[PDB]
Design a protein around this motif. Structure first.
Motif, mmCIF file in Angstrom:
data_model
loop_
_atom_site.group_PDB
_atom_site.id
_atom_site.type_symbol
_atom_site.label_atom_id
_atom_site.label_comp_id
_atom_site.label_asym_id
_atom_site.label_seq_id
_atom_site.Cartn_x
_atom_site.Cartn_y
_atom_site.Cartn_z
ATOM 1 N N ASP A 180 -22.989 3.964 10.676
ATOM 2 C CA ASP A 180 -22.623 3.355 12.079
ATOM 3 C C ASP A 180 -21.411 2.568 11.632
ATOM 4 O OD1 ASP A 180 -24.755 1.837 10.481
ATOM 5 O OD2 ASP A 180 -24.614 0.515 12.185
ATOM 6 N N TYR A 181 -21.257 2.037 10.400
ATOM 7 C CA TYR A 181 -20.066 1.075 10.078
ATOM 8 C C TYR A 181 -18.832 1.672 10.143
ATOM 9 C CZ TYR A 181 -23.389 -2.790 8.784
ATOM 10 O OH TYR A 181 -24.386 -3.726 8.625
ATOM 11 N N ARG A 182 -17.665 1.101 10.188
ATOM 12 C CA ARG A 182 -16.477 1.569 10.193
ATOM 13 C C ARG A 182 -15.813 1.427 8.577
ATOM 14 N NH1 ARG A 182 -11.635 -2.349 12.663
ATOM 15 N NH2 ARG A 182 -9.935 -0.622 12.887
ATOM 16 N N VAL A 183 -15.097 2.593 8.317
ATOM 17 C CA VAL A 183 -14.462 2.577 7.118
ATOM 18 C C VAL A 183 -13.173 2.205 7.219
ATOM 19 C CG1 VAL A 183 -13.793 4.012 5.075
ATOM 20 C CG2 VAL A 183 -16.181 4.221 6.110
ATOM 21 N N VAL A 184 -12.812 1.151 6.189
ATOM 22 C CA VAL A 184 -11.509 0.556 6.235
ATOM 23 C C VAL A 184 -10.976 0.651 4.774
ATOM 24 C CG1 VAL A 184 -9.938 -1.468 7.090
ATOM 25 C CG2 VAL A 184 -11.739 -0.715 8.432
ATOM 26 N N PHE A 185 -9.812 1.123 4.456
ATOM 27 C CA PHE A 185 -9.041 0.732 3.194
ATOM 28 C C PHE A 185 -8.111 -0.100 3.513
ATOM 29 C CE2 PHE A 185 -9.743 5.570 1.992
ATOM 30 C CZ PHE A 185 -11.402 5.442 1.723
ATOM 31 N N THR A 186 -7.710 -1.030 2.665
ATOM 32 C CA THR A 186 -6.604 -2.033 2.925
ATOM 33 C C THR A 186 -6.067 -2.439 1.401
ATOM 34 O OG1 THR A 186 -6.043 -3.837 4.127
ATOM 35 C CG2 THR A 186 -8.039 -3.871 2.934
ATOM 36 N N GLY A 187 -5.019 -3.092 1.577
ATOM 37 C CA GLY A 187 -4.034 -3.373 0.611
ATOM 38 C C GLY A 187 -2.926 -3.972 0.786
ATOM 39 N N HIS A 188 -2.667 -4.895 0.012
ATOM 40 C CA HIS A 188 -1.031 -5.519 0.143
ATOM 41 C C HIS A 188 -0.236 -4.888 -1.178
ATOM 42 C CE1 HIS A 188 1.411 -8.732 -1.713
ATOM 43 N NE2 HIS A 188 1.763 -8.714 -0.588
ATOM 44 N N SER A 189 0.886 -4.754 -1.012
ATOM 45 C CA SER A 189 1.940 -4.310 -1.975
ATOM 46 C C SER A 189 1.409 -2.880 -2.688
ATOM 47 C CB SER A 189 2.020 -5.468 -2.841
ATOM 48 O OG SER A 189 2.916 -5.205 -3.883
ATOM 49 N N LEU A 190 1.511 -2.995 -3.984
ATOM 50 C CA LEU A 190 1.140 -1.442 -4.768
ATOM 51 C C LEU A 190 -0.330 -1.172 -3.997
ATOM 52 C CD1 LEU A 190 0.810 0.622 -7.295
ATOM 53 C CD2 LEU A 190 -0.117 -1.477 -8.485
ATOM 54 N N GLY A 191 -1.251 -2.345 -4.123
ATOM 55 C CA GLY A 191 -2.581 -2.044 -3.273
ATOM 56 C C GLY A 191 -2.735 -1.471 -1.823
ATOM 57 N N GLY A 192 -1.497 -1.770 -1.139
ATOM 58 C CA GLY A 192 -1.292 -1.244 0.122
ATOM 59 C C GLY A 192 -1.034 0.341 0.043
ATOM 60 N N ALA A 193 -0.017 0.635 -1.030
ATOM 61 C CA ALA A 193 0.393 2.095 -1.411
ATOM 62 C C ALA A 193 -1.086 2.736 -1.691
ATOM 63 C CB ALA A 193 1.175 2.058 -2.607
ATOM 64 N N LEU A 194 -2.059 2.350 -2.606
ATOM 65 C CA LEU A 194 -3.149 2.858 -2.963
ATOM 66 C C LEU A 194 -4.036 3.243 -1.574
ATOM 67 C CD1 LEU A 194 -3.615 1.182 -6.350
ATOM 68 C CD2 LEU A 194 -2.741 3.150 -6.108
ATOM 69 N N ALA A 195 -4.265 2.169 -0.830
ATOM 70 C CA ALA A 195 -5.127 2.313 0.312
ATOM 71 C C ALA A 195 -4.379 3.442 1.286
ATOM 72 C CB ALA A 195 -5.171 1.227 1.063
#
Ligand SMILES: *[C@@H]1O[C@H](CO)[C@@H](O)[C@H](O)[C@H]1NC(C)=O
Ligand SMILES: *[C@@H]1O[C@H](CO)[C@@H](O)[C@H](O)[C@H]1NC(C)=O
Ligand SMILES: CCCCCCCCCCCC(=O)O
Ligand SMILES: CCCCCCCCCCCC(=O)O
Ligand SMILES: O=Cc1ccc([N+](=O)[O-])cc1
Lengths: 269, 269
Positions: free
Chosen positions: B137-152
């Motif tokens: 039931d939980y929502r899957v969220v990927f996140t990231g800033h900068s290069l981290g943002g790219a990878l997400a």
């Protein structure tokens, strides 16, 4: 909890104090505009504000900072930079007092701040005196963050009484001496010292009172958090030498709280 | 402008993205409360949020980040860290494309991002799949800033459509590949990409279009300044592949604007 007028001064000199680290000017000739990177000093940029003299690793303490002319606010500002790496500075920080009767009787100050100031004193006094001459109705203000705050405070105690008032705005300043100095700085005439602190910032909590150190009164204590904006309602005037219940509390202190005075200070984005 | 709920979400995942740099984390066991230094993630600290799995310098592109469980907001969040020194990272950024028909036919992605991801995908997929199984039931969220943002962004494009929605919140992300990959990102279902930018941030303007890169649509563009707090009115939804008039405008870009999404990000006080 403070007046809007005072909140506005506090914000302005927090930004002049931030400009001592940011905004490029390594050898920026005198008379150029004061600007900073990373939106560190927009109220300064908004004034008609120019450099008079820049200094760098000057004298025995490697003192750095600048003197500016502000035609909009009608100020002559001497701003001292704190240390280029504060966590280090904080670890290397010796607690030795030294006699300073040249400024007051029974007064001992921190040996490094005192000597650092003493070594640049003659050249900087002369630079302030020149501006005071060209602009007799401008307000003389000395300001600084961290080490820069200690220095400004010392420089103020040392150059007042020459016929122009010097106001001191310090941010996150450490203790600069013994109880008799604290007293001297609480009551000295020829200007006002505004000693501003934030939350559980560590630096105004050093050197410890258990090494002979005291704080002058009053303290202007910013209770809003790190990265939080400050309003006039978040600043409390705490009265009394070594008053407790502002920054001087027995809780655990913090370094990031040192880098947030109205905005980011002591580091440049 | 954007809704209060969506704003809240933006703020929250900016914090989960900041926490990848400023977590007092890693070498920290699963089940530990998630916390940051320097008031970097207070909305995460208020949530009942715990590490599921931490990774550091993993696989081919030294990938760093965390998988989190959040029982208050009902999330499973995979947060990727950007570079430890954004400035050098930007300077050494290589602009080579490599094919990724794997993700969508005709698609080419930045070669280092797709290979760093590719090299840790299998582990992190199993980690996410596990968590989805334990909390369907939980929502899957990927996140990231900068290069981290790219990878997400890449990880999302790669992992969507296996049964569970994957939302992606990116802050100051670079372009991650060619048009077509952009187009996939604009329309792909099984999740939404919220691609957040700020003022004249440098990073989302790299790799440049000229080297064969495009940005997915839409764009959430913060127009409040660096170190200025963000309100709902400061966020403008901008539509159109490679639309211009948000971050992608013809002026000099800035690194400090990269480090201010809702608060301080990509650096720790
Ligand atoms: C310096 O500031 C003044 C007024 O505040 C402005 O008129 C002048 O153009 C500025 N100089 C530069 C080089 O920007
Ligand atoms: C972790 O947080 C939970 C609730 O969010 C709290 O009950 C618990 O005390 C925390 N654990 C520690 C070690 O602080
Ligand atoms: C008044 C200006 C004082 C500036 C001196 C900063 C010296 C750089 C500090 C680097 C190492 C340290 O002191 O922690
Ligand atoms: C830890 C600091 C620098 C981290 C960057 C590692 C991976 C960056 C991706 C870019 C690959 C390239 O284009 O050079
Ligand atoms: O705090 C408000 C809030 C709204 C939405 C979400 N979310 O969807 O994760 C989280 C927090």
């Amino acid at each position: 909890e403070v007046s809007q007028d005072l909140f506005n001064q506090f914000n302005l000199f927090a930004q002049y104090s931030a400009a001592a680290y940011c905004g490029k000017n390594n050898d920026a000739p005198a008379g150029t505009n004061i600007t900073c990177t990373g939106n560190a000093c927009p109220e300064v940029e908004k004034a008609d504000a120019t450099f008079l003299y820049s200094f760098e690793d000057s004298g025995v303490g490697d003192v750095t900072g600048f003197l500016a002319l502000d035609n909009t606010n009608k100020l002559i500002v001497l701003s001292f930079r704190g240390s280029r790496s504060i966590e280090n500075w904080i670890g290397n920080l010796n607690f030795d007092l030294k006699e300073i009767n040249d400024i007051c009787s029974g007064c001992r100050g921190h040996d490094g701040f005192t000597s650092s100031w003493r070594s640049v004193a003659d050249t900087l006094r002369q630079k302030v005196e020149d501006a005071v001459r060209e602009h007799p109705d401008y307000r003389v203000v000395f300001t600084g963050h961290s080490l820069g705050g200690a220095l400004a405070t010392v420089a103020g105690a040392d150059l007042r009484g020459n016929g122009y008032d010097i106001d001191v705005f310090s941010y996150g300043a450490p203790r600069v001496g013994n109880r008799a100095f604290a007293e001297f700085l609480t009551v000295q005439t020829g200007g006002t010292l505004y000693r501003i602190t934030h939350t559980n910032d560590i630096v105004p909590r050093l050197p410890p009172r258990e090494f002979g150190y005291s704080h002058s009164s009053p303290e202007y204590w910013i209770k809003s958090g790190t990265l939080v904006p400050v309003t006039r309602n978040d600043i409390v005037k705490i009265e009394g030498i070594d008053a407790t219940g502002g920054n001087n509390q027995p809780n655990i202190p913090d370094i990031p709280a040192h880098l947030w005075y109205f905005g980011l200070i002591g580091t440049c984005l």
